[PDB]
Amino acid sequence: TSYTLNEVVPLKEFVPEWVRIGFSATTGAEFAAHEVLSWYFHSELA
Amino acid sequence: ETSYTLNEVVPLKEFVPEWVRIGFSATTGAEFAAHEVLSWYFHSELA
Amino acid sequence: TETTSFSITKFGPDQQNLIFQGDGYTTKERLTLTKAVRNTVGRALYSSPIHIWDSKTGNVANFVTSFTFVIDAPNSYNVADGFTFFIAPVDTKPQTGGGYLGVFNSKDYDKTSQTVAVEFDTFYNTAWDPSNGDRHIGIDVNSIKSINTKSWALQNGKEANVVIAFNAATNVLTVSLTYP
Amino acid sequence: TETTSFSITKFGPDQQNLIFQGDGYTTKERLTLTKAVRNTVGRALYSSPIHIWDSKTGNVANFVTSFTFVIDAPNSYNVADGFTFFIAPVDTKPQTGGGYLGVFNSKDYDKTSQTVAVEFDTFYNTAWDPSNGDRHIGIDVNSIKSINTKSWALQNGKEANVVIAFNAATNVLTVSLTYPN
Ligand SMILES: [Ca+2]
Ligand SMILES: [Ca+2]
Ligand SMILES: [Mn+2]
Ligand SMILES: [Mn+2]
């Protein structure tokens, strides 16, 4: 099954020149295990 | 053209930890020189 | 040109190129952000800062990341709170838990946050989430109130393949989620 | 499977993905390890740890690094001590300066060193260097005495391009430096 979402987000405006990237998960009164099984990343700044 | 080449069998796992940091080092003494790097690319792949 | 790339196909026991925060750890080939335990937070960051834009030149990076993740709740109705992929300042620490997913602190715009996150939110928080009350994908910039959402139906325990890409030429962030 | 890759074609004034030790800094788009000044050391490390082998499987990584560097000396004769690309533990700190190149402390094998380096050595140290006295490229494992060396004629102020490659299938470490023209 597939889900797609698209938005113009001008990153220069909101984030610093240097960033760290990652994953976050939380539980509350109700809960679930949240796991990542593989991760690929690539960026290119001209 | 001029090219200098060197090959050696070095069993890395006998010598370095599983996890490593890579880098450059340069020194001067009584005689000296500037040591500069203009570009750097690195790629590793552990099966 | 500055480029940074990596791939981790299976997470090992001492995944030293990752920084862990909260309860985040690696167990059995997997990065587990959260255990099926109440009221916790877990985050994991890539070790290197990545240069996402440059003020001299005004250039912004193109990037793509893909990951497959699993959410495993005790059943399909009692599920909370969600999971994020985020881009924050280099010194980012966990923010508010629960409904704020460990990445934000309010529904009002906070320029100081400097965090953009793509959320996979499994709990309807009446104060800011879609009125339909459905589970959803959202794009968040400096707030837990998403700028745009898509309803998503959670498949409990199944692996979901996600791709997020940013194109600097048009500034469109695209997120795609597929349960194969 | 784990891969780590990066490229820096122009270094900027706040290269946050490098760790600088000693005098290392970035200037006019270049990574400067030492200025032409006496008795100093400069090092720079990529900030992420890299998984080079695995004890559970015994697999070792394949890797390639390439870089262009410049040695710029006051003249062709008075040049010391040299330059290294190295592979060390994650917590590596500068070791002895001078002819030890900021990376080793001895001419004898030192198992606690855990570093291999490829040196571009511009100063003959009678104690361990190839007796011919020539400048040379060497492969160093846990010692400043190279297991293997090749004479290299330094072209002062000129760009050298090097490729270091490790093939996990043969455990061959290959080093190539080329001067244009
Ligand atoms: Ca929510
Ligand atoms: Ca020497
Ligand atoms: Mn939401
Ligand atoms: Mn030597």
Side-chain angles (χ1 to χ4, degrees):
Chain A
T1 325
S2 199
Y3 300 84
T4 57
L5 171 27
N6 271 98
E7 279 294 295
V8 168
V9 170
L11 241 15
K12 238 221 293 286
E13 308 301 305
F14 309 112
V15 130
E17 290 158 274
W18 283 91
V19 300
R20 272 214 259 232
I21 57 166
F23 297 114
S24 197
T26 54
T27 52
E30 280 135 78
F31 52 85
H34 295 277
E35 316 175 294
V36 176
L37 282 60
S38 55
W39 186 15
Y40 165 78
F41 182 77
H42 174 263
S43 60
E44 222 276 43
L45 179 66
Chain B
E1 98 275 286
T2 173
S3 293
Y4 308 80
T5 288
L6 177 65
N7 310 315
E8 194 50 54
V9 177
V10 46
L12 279 190
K13 82 153 164 294
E14 306 298 345
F15 314 111
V16 300
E18 289 163 278
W19 284 98
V20 297
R21 281 223 249 246
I22 63 165
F24 305 98
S25 201
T27 58
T28 58
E31 307 202 315
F32 52 90
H35 289 95
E36 300 182 317
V37 172
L38 285 60
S39 57
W40 190 15
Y41 159 78
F42 175 82
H43 184 65
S44 60
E45 146 74 291
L46 177 60
Chain C
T1 324
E2 272 172 67
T3 291
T4 303
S5 331
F6 66 87
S7 65
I8 304 164
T9 275
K10 304 186 288 76
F11 297 83
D14 192 29
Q15 194 64 47
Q16 296 197 207
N17 57 352
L18 251 35
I19 297 175
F20 303 90
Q21 298 186 149
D23 282 10
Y25 68 118
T26 225
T27 195
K28 158 257 163 62
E29 243 87 77
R30 285 164 153 65
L31 172 61
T32 83
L33 296 158
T34 255
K35 290 240 65 282
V37 151
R38 61 191 69 236
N39 303 121
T40 51
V41 188
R43 320 196 320 170
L45 315 180
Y46 184 58
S47 226
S48 173
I50 79 129
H51 203 168
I52 223 166
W53 66 279
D54 169 49
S55 66
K56 195 180 189 79
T57 305
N59 289 354
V60 194
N62 294 298
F63 61 89
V64 59
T65 186
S66 52
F67 43 95
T68 110
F69 76 110
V70 170
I71 285 172
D72 201 288
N75 62 70
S76 311
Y77 303 97
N78 299 326
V79 189
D81 266 286
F83 156 84
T84 258
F85 166 76
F86 63 101
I87 296 170
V90 179
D91 58 9
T92 185
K93 76 165 192 63
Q95 306 295 300
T96 299
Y100 293 93
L101 304 180
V103 287
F104 302 98
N105 302 277
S106 52
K107 88 187 195 304
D108 315 299
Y109 190 87
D110 176 12
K111 62 150 184 292
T112 302
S113 178
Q114 293 169 81
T115 300
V116 164
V118 176
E119 51 164 60
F120 298 86
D121 184 340
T122 52
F123 186 89
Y124 170 47
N125 300 86
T126 50
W128 56 75
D129 278 333
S131 296
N132 63 10
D134 278 338
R135 234 73 126 191
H136 49 279
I137 301 160
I139 291 167
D140 307 340
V141 333
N142 298 332
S143 178
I144 197 38
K145 182 169 61 202
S146 306
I147 56 178
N148 188 225
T149 55
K150 190 181 208 183
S151 292
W152 142 73
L154 194 243
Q155 289 180 207
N156 196 195
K158 296 294 161 58
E159 311 173 350
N161 293 340
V162 181
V163 175
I164 289 162
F166 182 80
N167 180 344
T170 59
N171 282 304
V172 84
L173 180 73
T174 297
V175 22
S176 163
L177 166 35
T178 307
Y179 286 103
Chain D
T1 310
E2 271 170 78
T3 63
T4 298
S5 336
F6 61 91
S7 69
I8 302 174
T9 264
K10 118 210 99 296
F11 294 79
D14 189 24
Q15 207 53 54
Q16 294 205 24
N17 58 354
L18 303 184
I19 296 173
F20 295 98
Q21 282 170 345
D23 285 349
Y25 70 117
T26 51
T27 335
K28 300 174 161 307
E29 283 121 15
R30 293 161 169 217
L31 165 56
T32 303
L33 272 14
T34 58
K35 182 176 149 280
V37 84
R38 273 173 282 263
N39 290 305
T40 55
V41 59
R43 313 205 318 160
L45 310 154
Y46 185 59
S47 58
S48 176
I50 289 152
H51 200 2
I52 211 72
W53 65 278
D54 174 38
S55 57
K56 183 154 174 150
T57 59
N59 295 329
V60 182
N62 289 292
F63 58 88
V64 245
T65 199
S66 64
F67 47 94
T68 294
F69 77 95
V70 178
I71 293 166
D72 192 54
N75 52 250
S76 305
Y77 306 105
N78 291 308
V79 190
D81 258 295
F83 161 64
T84 262
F85 167 72
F86 63 100
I87 296 166
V90 165
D91 67 326
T92 195
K93 285 148 207 209
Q95 303 296 295
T96 305
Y100 292 87
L101 271 28
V103 58
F104 301 104
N105 300 304
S106 178
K107 165 257 274 164
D108 293 322
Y109 188 85
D110 172 17
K111 55 182 190 168
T112 75
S113 174
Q114 295 208 286
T115 123
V116 343
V118 171
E119 55 166 56
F120 298 88
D121 186 335
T122 61
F123 186 88
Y124 174 50
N125 304 90
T126 37
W128 57 80
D129 273 322
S131 57
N132 66 11
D134 290 334
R135 298 178 173 133
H136 49 288
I137 294 151
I139 289 167
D140 299 349
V141 353
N142 294 146
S143 173
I144 198 52
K145 292 205 275 287
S146 305
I147 69 182
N148 205 4
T149 247
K150 162 60 51 62
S151 298
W152 146 63
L154 167 71
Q155 291 191 35
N156 190 27
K158 173 147 165 181
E159 300 180 358
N161 307 122
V162 358
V163 191
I164 289 181
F166 183 78
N167 176 19
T170 55
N171 278 128
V172 181
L173 219 195
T174 302
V175 182
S176 183
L177 112 44
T178 64
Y179 276 127
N181 297 305

Short mmCIF file of all heavy atoms in Angstrom, two decimals, chain D residues 119 121 129 136, ligand 4:
data_model
loop_
_atom_site.label_atom_id
_atom_site.label_comp_id
_atom_site.label_asym_id
_atom_site.label_seq_id
_atom_site.Cartn_x
_atom_site.Cartn_y
_atom_site.Cartn_z
N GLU D 119 52.87 7.30 4.72
CA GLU D 119 53.64 8.52 4.90
C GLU D 119 54.20 9.03 3.59
O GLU D 119 54.51 8.27 2.69
CB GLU D 119 54.79 8.27 5.88
CG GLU D 119 55.71 7.13 5.50
CD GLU D 119 57.02 7.06 6.27
OE1 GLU D 119 57.00 7.02 7.49
OE2 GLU D 119 58.06 7.11 5.62
N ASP D 121 57.25 11.16 3.29
CA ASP D 121 58.30 11.59 4.20
C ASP D 121 59.38 12.40 3.48
O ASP D 121 60.13 11.81 2.70
CB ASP D 121 58.90 10.32 4.87
CG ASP D 121 59.96 10.48 5.99
OD1 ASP D 121 60.65 11.49 6.06
OD2 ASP D 121 60.15 9.60 6.80
N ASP D 129 64.95 5.58 8.62
CA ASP D 129 64.63 5.80 7.24
C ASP D 129 65.48 5.07 6.26
O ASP D 129 66.56 4.64 6.66
CB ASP D 129 64.64 7.31 7.00
CG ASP D 129 63.26 7.86 7.35
OD1 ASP D 129 62.32 7.16 7.04
OD2 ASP D 129 63.09 8.94 7.91
N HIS D 136 60.50 9.71 0.37
CA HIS D 136 59.82 8.47 0.00
C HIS D 136 58.41 8.41 0.54
O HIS D 136 58.07 9.06 1.53
CB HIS D 136 60.61 7.23 0.54
CG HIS D 136 60.94 7.45 2.01
ND1 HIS D 136 61.84 8.29 2.51
CD2 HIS D 136 60.35 6.84 3.08
CE1 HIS D 136 61.83 8.21 3.79
NE2 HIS D 136 60.93 7.30 4.19
MN MN E 4 60.04 7.38 6.50
#
